[PDB]
Amino acid sequence: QPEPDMITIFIGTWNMGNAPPPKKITSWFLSKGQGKTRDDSADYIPHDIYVIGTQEDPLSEKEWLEILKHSLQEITSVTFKTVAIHTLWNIRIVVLAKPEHENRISHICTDNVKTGIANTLGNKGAVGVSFMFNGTSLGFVNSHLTSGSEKKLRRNQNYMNILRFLALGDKKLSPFNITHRFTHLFWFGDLNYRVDLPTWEAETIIQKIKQQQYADLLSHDQLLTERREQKVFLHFEEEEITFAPTYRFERLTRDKYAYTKQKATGMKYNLPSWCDRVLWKSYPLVHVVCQSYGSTSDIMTSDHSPVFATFEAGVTSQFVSKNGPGTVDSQGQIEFLRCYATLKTKSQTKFYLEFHSSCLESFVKSQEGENEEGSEGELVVKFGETLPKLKPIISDPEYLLDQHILISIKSSDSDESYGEGCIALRLEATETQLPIYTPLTHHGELTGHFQGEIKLQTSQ
Ligand SMILES: O=C(Nc1ccon1)c1cccc(Cl)c1
């Protein structure tokens, strides 16, 4: 029974509006409705993993698990196993997997982050799950960010707090936040970004939606504009949106957007918006393809419509050789030539690197680099040919070319990371000097770059 080199992953996000769901929600898990939808010919083919994020969820865990499992069994005739479930207030994540995957899944972590302070602490935040699927690390975040059209900067702050403080994945990756811990990270939820057009334009917006003309609305979507300005979700992907705004609907129909201010809304307008989103970030040169991104049309208990996204994701085996794991395989090596970091910092500490990878027995600390002044007022840290030769546990190119090296640049004075990035070993050639590059981030914001050359020796 061979180990897979690809799986499919379903991501769902639904703000349930504190109401129980209707009796049938299968259209969600089938990726049917509006947008990029799934072909009918796939309806009986189960996804490998289903990840369900809810917000304003009124159900108990037991109640929602029974609905989800009975839904999937009706679609697929498969009884899914529960990998994890975690709830913060009314924000919930459920991970279900095909029973054949049960002994491929390990290292299951859950965590939550509560956002805000005083007034604004008590209902917004995020839940997450991570695990290993054979050789591949997977992370999932469901966040309910701050509401309201004039609070985009709050939402961006909520995002930074969640990625800083959510504790998922391998704790030995101490310099790295969740945006670097996983082969594939999926971040979804009621992100609550709005279409920023004047209140007076509400009926104009509604008209546009009825004509399926979304371009002049998407050009004002706050998530797209904040991402384009590098204010949030740096280095994440999102599929093109081709479905109508998923908020705010009159309940029990989808014929009406309920946008006008009411006491129940704090006298705020809710112009039609794409509140409900799925984004992802995968390591460089790993296969990930979005195969659906859309909203259901027939689930109408909430003022939001459910959103679905599905992905093909590359996965790798749990590799064993005669040598590693448990020793190095001295037919493998990783060399860095002519490497330098460019940092936005004003500081003048010396810096050193750490190299982290599950292809190493443990992380590797470099010597301090040589600081120079860049022409345009930057710090350039030169490592030259001074960097330690990395000794992978396995030399087989079928394993080693699929790996990645995480890099942190740390202050000698504080041991704090000033920037994190990732280099793929999926090279065009072995035993050949080749350019490498990663941006560097800290707390998910750009802090610099790392570039140089690599030389990879495998057993072939
Ligand atoms: O123990 C598991 N899941 C849960 C969640 C709540 O209680 N048990 C588990 C462990 C490994 C693989 C799988 Cl498919 C499931």
Tokens of 32: 């049917």
Instruction: Please indicate, yes or no, whether residues 346 and 450 belong to a single structural domain of this protein.
Output: yes
The tokens 């994190």 sit on which residue?
420
| Cβ neighbour number for residue 386 with a 10 Å cutoff | 13
Instruction: Please indicate, yes or no, whether residues 255 and 361 belong to a single structural domain of this protein.
Output: no
Strand-pair category, 6-15 with 49-55: parallel
Tokens of 376: 């345009």
The rounded distance, in Å, linking the Cα atoms of 195 and 417 is: 36
Gap from CA of 111 to ligand 1 centroid (Å): 15
Instruction: Please indicate, yes or no, whether residues 144 and 252 belong to a single structural domain of this protein.
Output: yes
Cα 73–78–83 angle (5° rounding)? 95
Tokens of 265: 């809304």
Q: Which of 55, 29, 61 is nearest to 142 (CA)?
A: 55
The rounded distance, in Å, linking the Cα atoms of 70 and 52 is: 14
Domain boundary among the residues 267, 290, 325 is at: 325
Q: Pick the atom of ligand 1 nearest to 103's CA.
A: 12
Domain boundary among the residues 301, 325, 349 is at: 325
Q: Is 405 helix (H, G, I), strand (E, B) or coil?
A: strand
Tokens of 136: 């591949």
Amino acid of residue 349 = T
Strands (E), 256-306: 276-282, 288-295
| Cβ neighbour number for residue 316 with a 10 Å cutoff | 18
Gap from CA of 112 to ligand 1 centroid (Å): 18
Instruction: Please indicate, yes or no, whether residues 30 and 98 belong to a single structural domain of this protein.
Output: yes
Q: Pick the atom of ligand 1 nearest to 106's CA.
A: 11
Whether the Cβ atoms of residue 113 and residue 119 lie closer than 8 Å to each other: no
Tokens of 172: 């030995």
Whether omega before 164 lies within 30 degrees of 0, making that bond cis, reads: no
The rounded distance, in Å, linking the Cα atoms of 140 and 231 is: 21
The H or E element containing residue 62 is helix 61-76
The H or E element containing residue 83 is strand 81-88
DSSP 8-state assignment for residue 74: H
Q: Pick the atom of ligand 1 nearest to 84's CA.
A: 5
Whether omega before 175 lies within 30 degrees of 0, making that bond cis, reads: no
Strand-pair category, 333-343 with 379-384: antiparallel
DSSP 4-48: PSEEEEEEEEEE-TTS---S--HHHHTT-SEEE---GGGTTS--S
| Cβ neighbour number for residue 24 with a 10 Å cutoff | 11
DSSP 8-state assignment for residue 427: -
Q: Phi and psi for 156 in degrees, rounded to 5?
A: -65, -40
Instruction: Please indicate, yes or no, whether residues 263 and 354 belong to a single structural domain of this protein.
Output: no
Cα 238–240–243 angle (5° rounding)? 115
The rounded distance, in Å, linking the Cα atoms of 234 and 41 is: 36
Gap from CA of 69 to ligand 1 centroid (Å): 14
Gap from CA of 190 to ligand 1 centroid (Å): 26
Instruction: Please indicate, yes or no, whether residues 305 and 336 belong to a single structural domain of this protein.
Output: no
The rounded distance, in Å, linking the Cα atoms of 27 and 33 is: 7
The rounded distance, in Å, linking the Cα atoms of 345 and 173 is: 23
Mutate to test the pocket of ligand 1, among 108, 109, 132 (most ligand atoms within 8 A of CB): 108
Tokens of 63: 């109640």
Q: Phi and psi for 80 in degrees, rounded to 5?
A: -80, 150
Method used to obtain the model: X-ray
Gap from CA of 319 to ligand 1 centroid (Å): 23
The rounded distance, in Å, linking the Cα atoms of 424 and 403 is: 6
The rounded distance, in Å, linking the Cα atoms of 312 and 422 is: 21
| Cβ neighbour number for residue 345 with a 10 Å cutoff | 17
Tell me how many domains the chain contains: 2
The rounded distance, in Å, linking the Cα atoms of 399 and 317 is: 9
Instruction: Please indicate, yes or no, whether residues 407 and 286 belong to a single structural domain of this protein.
Output: no
Residue nearest to atom 3 of ligand 1 (CA): 83
Gap from CA of 72 to ligand 1 centroid (Å): 17
Instruction: Please indicate, yes or no, whether residues 351 and 460 belong to a single structural domain of this protein.
Output: yes
The rounded distance, in Å, linking the Cα atoms of 87 and 104 is: 24
Full domain range(s) for residue 425: 326-460
Chain breaks in the chain (C to N over 2.5 A) after: none
Q: Pick the atom of ligand 1 nearest to 102's CA.
A: 14
Q: Which residues does a 6 A CB cutoff place in the pocket of ligand 1?
A: 81-84, 97, 102, 105, 108
Whether the Cβ atoms of residue 445 and residue 156 lie closer than 8 Å to each other: no
Gap from CA of 419 to ligand 1 centroid (Å): 35
Instruction: Please indicate, yes or no, whether residues 226 and 344 belong to a single structural domain of this protein.
Output: no
Q: Where are the alpha helices (DSSP H) in 37-134?
A: 61-76
Residue nearest to atom 14 of ligand 1 (CA): 102
Residue 37 contacts by C-beta under 8 Å, 6 or more apart in sequence? 31, 292, 294
The rounded distance, in Å, linking the Cα atoms of 312 and 320 is: 25
Would the CA dihedral through 357, 360, 363, 369 be positive or negative?
negative
Residue 320 contacts by C-beta under 8 Å, 6 or more apart in sequence? none
Domain boundary among the residues 325, 340, 364 is at: 325
Q: Which of 280, 276, 192 is nearest to 235 (CA)?
A: 280
Q: Pick the atom of ligand 1 nearest to 97's CA.
A: 14
Cα of 197 vs its chain's centroid, Å? 28
Whether the Cβ atoms of residue 440 and residue 450 lie closer than 8 Å to each other: yes
Strand-pair category, 417-424 with 364-368: unpaired
Whether the Cβ atoms of residue 128 and residue 87 lie closer than 8 Å to each other: no
Tokens of 118: 């005083």
The rounded distance, in Å, linking the Cα atoms of 19 and 93 is: 17
Instruction: Please indicate, yes or no, whether residues 318 and 443 belong to a single structural domain of this protein.
Output: no
Resolution in A: 1.2
The rounded distance, in Å, linking the Cα atoms of 124 and 158 is: 9
Instruction: Please indicate, yes or no, whether residues 105 and 216 belong to a single structural domain of this protein.
Output: yes
The tokens 């939606």 sit on which residue?
209
Q: Is 177 helix (H, G, I), strand (E, B) or coil?
A: coil
Gap from CA of 86 to ligand 1 centroid (Å): 12
Instruction: Please indicate, yes or no, whether residues 347 and 386 belong to a single structural domain of this protein.
Output: yes
